[PDB]
């Protein structure tokens, strides 16, 4: 049938929870909790977290996306009571090949041409980031380092980077506690896949490196008795 | 050899004026010929002629610019079971119709003189 | 007259192989090895055409399929590094387009029982012997002409030698959606795979990037009749077809 | 508009020289450098055609025409031994057909007075410094890129450095039935000689046989105006045109 059920576009185009995070806004410095998960967060997007622990995309070799990040932010601190008074959240898609913020009140939240959105807490925002790929397809499964020269990092192959999401709060006034949970749902459009690949045996042990984990249990099942079935 | 025997034999030609290869590696980078053993027995290879100083030197010297042909085992010879011996190859030579012979000589070959008549 | 298998002269440059038993051909996909990545740039062309002098059948070293053997793995554009005019074009330039034609031949008598699986795996990333958040540092990856040599040659620091996971985390009988052909000693003694060029970037360095791993692995063990040698040879030849390079009128000398 | 001398781009391979002052041309004889030694052998041809990639303008080292200078002599097919793809084709093959185009240029200002004689001498056999029944053992003959360097560099065991006998027993002003052109600093600053191939055997080794000696010699001494440098440079470039080699699909490797 020519029905979009078992084709590739329906196959990968569902929206899945990636990158649960939890931020707040307190003060300039205030109480010494600034850097780890508070006042801002950068993700450095990678579908390597929870696309069923990298399976359906790893079934193919070469893909091309057109992503739709739908950021669902919510107020973990009782929104029913308060902790939501115009709590405007700022998202930001920092493209690959651009500097990353590492502070809440930092210059690259307001800089030039960095796509940033603002929405109410407890509401959503829909994106459409086009195919930001260095290669003509996303090399999800690549053999080779970056150079025999200086060589950027290692065969993680972050050269075909997709982007980097940044989330922060524009608010003030340390007298109180708030907490905001942000949950982004990636969805891929117009997915064009190439070069089918045999599936993995184990759940993985690394991102980027196609390593199979040590100390394994048997992935295949013993016969219930002998070759004699039933 | 036997019918149920197989082998791969690289045989290589190197032109006159070139040092001949030292192993199967250097022969393979030459104009290597396999035409293997196991389904084909008769292997013919033409030997192209190249003009040096307009012809070939026909005076007795041991110069090493006359051409060089040699053969190597690409793999080991697979003998049939309980063969327990040796097999052999037979090598022939002749001239293609392009051959040419120009001046005639005396042809001593033994420093010849016998005047025996009966 | 009688049997007329395609065993005639495939002579090509310095190479005059023509050793074909049951000369059936399986190509990787519907795409043949094709030269042109585009038409033109609306300009006069000095395009690097080495197909007149790269299309030789560069054979490899022969490898001995014993009963206690597990498999062999060569990284295909980097197997031919220290050899041929193709290797000197590889170091001499940087970037090149290379479609390949791989002809794996196994000498076997009528009396030998066993089966092989040849398989061409595009972009075969490796799994480490460490098996953690580290892999081989690409010294142990591609020795060239020697392969990874999975058959009981275990080592430390580089790739794993586990044959069921085939350095990939995948599964052995599940590997066949890659191009493949079975060498069945009842039926055939050789196998051919026709490999077109495959990369998301149309032109790429082969010194840096390992396009293809080639694996020949015994699925069924070799049972020779007793009183014969418990070893059979595997010969693999590569003919890089419709091969292109980039560094036209540019490259002077880089020694390594 | 005005003077329109032929100074446009003679670009050729990696070479983009186009330095021509009074770009008049003297060819050696009526014969141009021509490729074909014959038509065919009534057969399909794989004839070695390196003219796509040999026709570069391989320049030399520059040499300083002082007032106390006598001359310079390079053996032309063996001057380009350790250099270029032409030198690696020379050792790589044995026999080759090579017509040459030699462009000798002398930088000179308006104020410098002197004259040069370039001359192309076919099969220039040498006269020894011993001057007896022995000559040079062909170590001191053709240093390559350095020349014999007749200008007051006397030595022992090899060729003579006498410039009137020009290592030949001949005479200096009598030398002009060989192809030649005078570099007159009143008129020109450069000279071109177009050398077709010349040998009694149609195809020949250039590692063994020295086809051409090239001599640039000052007939009139250079008088610079005082207060300037008493030295002028000579630059010589060789473009081997319509060049052919013999060892097709034959040569693997010879190192030396």
UniProtKB/Swiss-Prot annotation, chain A:
Domain of life (superkingdom): Viruses
Location within or outside the cell: Virion; Host cytoplasm
Disulfide-bond pairs as recorded: none
Subunit field text: Interacts with capsid protein VP0, and capsid protein VP3 to form heterotrimeric protomers. Five protomers subsequently associate to form pentamers which serve as building blocks for the capsid. Interacts with capsid protein VP2, capsid protein VP3 and capsid protein VP4 following cleavage of capsid protein VP0. Interacts with host ICAM1.
Protein role: Forms an icosahedral capsid of pseudo T=3 symmetry with capsid proteins VP2 and VP3. The capsid is 300 Angstroms in diameter, composed of 60 copies of each capsid protein and enclosing the viral positive strand RNA genome. Capsid protein VP1 mainly forms the vertices of the capsid. Capsid protein VP1 interacts with host ICAM1 to provide virion attachment to target host cells. This attachment induces virion internalization. Tyrosine kinases are probably involved in the entry process. After binding to its receptor, the capsid undergoes conformational changes.
Protein name: Capsid protein VP1
Species, as recorded: Human rhinovirus 14
Taxonomic placement: Viruses, Riboviria, Orthornavirae, Pisuviricota, Pisoniviricetes
Curated annotation (Swiss-Prot), chain B:
Compartments reported by the entry: Virion; Host cytoplasm
Domain of life assignment: Viruses
Membrane spanning stretches: none
Subunit description: Interacts with capsid protein VP0 and capsid protein VP1 to form heterotrimeric protomers. Five protomers subsequently associate to form pentamers which serve as building blocks for the capsid. Interacts with capsid protein VP4 in the mature capsid. Interacts with protein 2C; this interaction may be important for virion morphogenesis.
Role: Forms an icosahedral capsid of pseudo T=3 symmetry with capsid proteins VP2 and VP3. The capsid is 300 Angstroms in diameter, composed of 60 copies of each capsid protein and enclosing the viral positive strand RNA genome.
Name of the protein in its database record: Capsid protein VP3
Species per Swiss-Prot/TrEMBL record: Human rhinovirus 14
Positions spanned in the full protein: 450 to 567 of 2179
Curated annotation (Swiss-Prot), chains C, D:
Domain of life: Viruses
Localization per record: Virion; Host cytoplasm
Subunit structure: Interacts with capsid protein VP1 and capsid protein VP3 in the mature capsid.
Function: Forms an icosahedral capsid of pseudo T=3 symmetry with capsid proteins VP2 and VP3. The capsid is 300 Angstroms in diameter, composed of 60 copies of each capsid protein and enclosing the viral positive strand RNA genome.
Name of this chain's protein: Capsid protein VP2
Range covered out of full length: 76 to 331 of 2179
């Amino acid at each position: 049938f020519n029905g979009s059920e078992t084709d590739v576009e329906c196959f990968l185009g569902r929206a899945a929870c990636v990158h649960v995070t939890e931020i707040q806004n307190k003060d300039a410095t205030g109480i010494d909790n600034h850097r780890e998960a508070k006042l801002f967060n950068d993700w450095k997007i990678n579908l390597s977290s929870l696309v069923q622990l990298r399976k359906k995309l790893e079934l193919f070799t070469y893909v091309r996306f057109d992503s739709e990040y739908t950021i669902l932010a919510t107020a973990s601190q009782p929104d029913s009571a308060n902790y939501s008074s115009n709590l405007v959240v700022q998202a930001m898609y920092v493209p690959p090949g651009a500097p990353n913020p590492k502070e809440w009140d930092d210059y690259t939240w307001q800089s030039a041409s960095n796509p940033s959105v603002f929405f109410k807490v407890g509401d959503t925002s829909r994106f459409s980031v086009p195919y930001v790929g260095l290669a003509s397809a996303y090399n999800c499964f690549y053999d080779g380092y970056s150079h025999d020269d200086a060589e950027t990092q290692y065969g993680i192959t972050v050269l075909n980077h997709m982007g980097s999401m940044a989330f922060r709060i524009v608010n003030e006034h340390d007298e109180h506690k708030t907490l905001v949970k942000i949950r982004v749902y990636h969805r891929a459009k117009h997915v064009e896949a190439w070069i089918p690949r045999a599936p993995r045996a184990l759940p993985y042990t690394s991102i980027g490196r196609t390593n199979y984990p040590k100390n394994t249990e048997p992935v295949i099942k013993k016969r219930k008795g002998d070759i004699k079935s039933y | 050899g036997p019918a149920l025997s197989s082998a791969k034999l690289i045989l290589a030609y190197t032109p006159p004026g070139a040092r001949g290869p030292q192993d199967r590696r250097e022969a393979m980078l030459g104009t290597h010929v396999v035409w293997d053993i196991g389904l084909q027995s008769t292997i013919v290879m033409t030997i192209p002629w190249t003009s040096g100083v307009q012809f070939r030197y026909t005076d007795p010297d041991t110069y090493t610019s006359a051409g060089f042909l040699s053969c190597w085992y690409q793999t080991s010879l697979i003998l049939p079971p309980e063969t327990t011996g040796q097999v052999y190859l037979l090598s022939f030579i002749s001239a293609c119709p392009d051959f040419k012979l120009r001046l005639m000589k005396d042809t001593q070959t033994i420093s010849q003189t016998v005047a025996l008549t009966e | 007259c009688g049997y007329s298998d395609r065993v005639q002269q495939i002579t090509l440059g310095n190479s005059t192989i023509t050793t074909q038993e049951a000369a059936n051909a399986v190509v990787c996909y519907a795409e043949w090895p094709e030269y042109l990545p585009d038409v033109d740039a609306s300009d006069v062309n000095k395009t690097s055409k080495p197909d007149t002098s790269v299309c030789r059948f560069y054979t490899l070293d022969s490898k001995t399929w014993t009963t206690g053997s597990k498999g062999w793995c060569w990284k295909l554009p980097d197997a031919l590094k220290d050899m041929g005019v193709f290797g000197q074009n590889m170091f001499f330039h940087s970037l090149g387009r290379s479609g390949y034609t791989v002809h794996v031949q196994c000498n076997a008598t009528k009396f030998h029982s066993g089966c092989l699986l040849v398989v061409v795996i595009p972009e075969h990333q490796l799994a480490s012997h460490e098996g953690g958040n580290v892999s081989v540092k690409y010294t142990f990856t591609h020795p060239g002409e020697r392969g990874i040599d999975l058959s009981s040659a275990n080592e430390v620091g580089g790739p794993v030698k586990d044959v069921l996971y085939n350095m990939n985390g995948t599964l052995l009988g599940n590997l066949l959606i890659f191009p493949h052909q079975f060498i069945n000693l009842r039926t055939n003694n050789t196998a051919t795979i026709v490999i077109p060029y495959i990369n998301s970037v149309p032109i790429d360095s082969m010194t840096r990037h390992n396009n293809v791993s080639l694996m020949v692995i015994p699925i069924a063990p070799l049972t020779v009749p007793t009183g014969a040698t418990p070893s059979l040879p595997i010969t693999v030849t590569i003919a890089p077809m419709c091969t292109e390079f980039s560094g036209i009128r540019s490259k002077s000398i880089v020694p390594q």
